[PDB]
Design a protein around this ligand. Structure first.
Ligand SMILES: Cc1cc2nc3c(=O)[nH]c(=O)nc-3n(C[C@H](O)[C@H](O)[C@H](O)COP(=O)(O)OP(=O)(O)OC[C@H]3O[C@@H](n4cnc5c(N)ncnc54)[C@H](O)[C@@H]3O)c2cc1C
Ligand SMILES: Cc1cc2nc3c(=O)[nH]c(=O)nc-3n(C[C@H](O)[C@H](O)[C@H](O)COP(=O)(O)OP(=O)(O)OC[C@H]3O[C@@H](n4cnc5c(N)ncnc54)[C@H](O)[C@@H]3O)c2cc1C
Ligand SMILES: COc1cc(N[C@@H](C)CCCN)c2ncccc2c1
Ligand SMILES: COc1cc(N[C@@H](C)CCCN)c2ncccc2c1
Ligand SMILES: [Zn+2]
Ligand SMILES: [Zn+2]
Lengths: 230, 230
């Protein structure tokens, strides 16, 4: 063993279904003997905005502000804001990063989008070269554990929302694969708010049970075909 | 014939390529006689986080906080935070909403994601029923004006990033169409950083030129087929 996990958790309410999925993950991975860390973004009041406050000391170009260039240079020069570098250390140490969130507008809640925007800077998460298969977080696993308002049936190719895989593309491919993660199959807990107690319990147990064997999983082929093909 | 436009703008730097695209839109729509409003999110320090500070009234359930439920009720009761209702007024009055932003992780910058999350609440933007074609913002047009780091070639079906339309899905369909907007074709200004100065000037002029006839355009068919093909 000796496996290290970071859970990046984005829900306001400890008693929520998301909260329970997060807690079951902590419980089960802790039981296994894994090293576990949680970034509870709302509790941390995590800053989502990409601004010039993310660089400490003198800017590379104080007259014209380019977030990408400034953060790349700040990473190289150990001059990023401590909230960012605190998260980078957690990611650097992790073998697996689990994202636990409710689907907001076919994507992550803004607080979690901000974590992605600000934490995954050039030089840390990807570079030229070093992206997609050679992304700098290569060797690590990532997994999206998402809850939805809509039902499984709505998230079908011919359903009103389209296939759930369609909304996964920017997250799994554009973000996680880009940074070199192997992407484990998403955990999608459909429509807990209208599910029965029994069904909800089932979904939480599926997740806990899945976690028992998470280290034996094969990553998905994070391709356009997987997301969009038949 | 008396058209109102809201530009929701998400860039930190007034001298940026995004800044120029926003300014030329203001100039050209102003020249046409349109009524124009801009929400400059970074300059506004717009709050992106969905939190219980977004409701000031008595909560429906003060023991277990459900953001969707509480904001829906707060919208009906008029106890939403005023920054949200300020944006809703701008949207309510607009005939066309243009979003001007750099692509961040195949999506919008977090500050703009937060605008979507917080402003487009139930009761205001959609109801149950009252979504997709019957969304509450029906009759309005929306348009994504996006800039990218990657080139046009990279954003094709056989390119490393996949086709550009793939990443539009959560924004155009999952968000805008869901709220009832008709969606005008996106403006994607590819890779301005790589482009020559002449090519950049060309991209800005192309947007201004397109705006001259924007009111004659038809919306796209905002469907899975449009985004993903056969
Ligand atoms: C801004 C915004 C945008 C949204 N966009 C979308 C979208 O694009 N697409 C979409 O489909 N949905 C969308 N939604 C809906 C959203 O995804 C769901 O509301 C969310 O996923 C529900 O998860 P939750 O943890 O908040 O559920 P909760 O309301 O916290 O949980 C549901 C029920 O499960 C119960 N529960 C908690 N723990 C357990 C347990 N251990 N065992 C059994 N029951 C338990 C809870 O008590 C509760 O009764 C959006 C919502 C918002 C606010
Ligand atoms: C957190 C983050 C995530 C990102 N994710 C992605 C992603 O998923 N996919 C992707 O492809 N890219 C991504 N990028 C790259 C990003 O999308 C580009 O950096 C951005 O789109 C560039 O637009 P800009 O306005 O910042 O360019 P600028 O750097 O401001 O513009 C380039 C040049 O244009 C010049 N200029 C300004 N106005 C004019 C004018 N009127 N005429 C001529 N020249 C002018 C500027 O002076 C500058 O020299 C990401 C960047 C960041 C920081
Ligand atoms: C595109 O689908 C949704 C669904 C939402 N919420 C519903 C499903 C209630 C949760 C289950 N009872 C959304 N809520 C807010 C904003 C966008 C939504 C989109
Ligand atoms: C986190 O930043 C990026 C940048 C990308 N593209 C390069 C070309 C940026 C160039 C502008 N300086 C991405 N491309 C694809 C997917 C994610 C990206 C993230
Ligand atoms: Zn991929
Ligand atoms: Zn659509």
């Amino acid at each position: 063993a000796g496996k290290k996990v970071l859970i990046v958790y984005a829900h306001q309410e400890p008693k929520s279904f998301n909260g329970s999925l997060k807690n079951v993950a902590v419980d089960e991975l802790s039981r296994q003997g894994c090293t576990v860390t949680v970034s509870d973004l709302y509790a941390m009041n995590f800053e989502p905005r990409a601004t010039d406050k993310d660089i400490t000391g003198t800017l590379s170009n104080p007259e014209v502000f380019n977030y990408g260039v400034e953060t790349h240079e700040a990473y190289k020069q150990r001059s990023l804001a401590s909230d960012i570098t605190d998260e980078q250390k957690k990611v650097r140490e992790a073998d697996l990063v689990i994202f636990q969130f409710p689907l907001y507008w076919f994507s992550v809640p803004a607080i979690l989008k901000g974590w992605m925007d600000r934490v995954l800077c050039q030089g840390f998460a990807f570079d030229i070269p070093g992206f997609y298969d050679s992304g700098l977080l290569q060797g690590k696993l990532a997994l999206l554990s998402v809850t939805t308002g809509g039902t499984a049936e709505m998230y079908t190719k011919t359903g009103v929302n389209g296939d759930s895989r369609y909304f996964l593309w920017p997250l799994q491919h554009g973000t996680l694969h880009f940074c070199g993660f192997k992407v484990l199959a998403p955990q999608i807990s459909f429509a807990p708010e209208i599910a029965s107690e029994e069904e909800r319990k089932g979904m939480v147990a599926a997740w806990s049970q899945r976690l028992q064997t998470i280290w034996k999983e094969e990553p998905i082929p994070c391709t356009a075909h997987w997301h969009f093909g038949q």
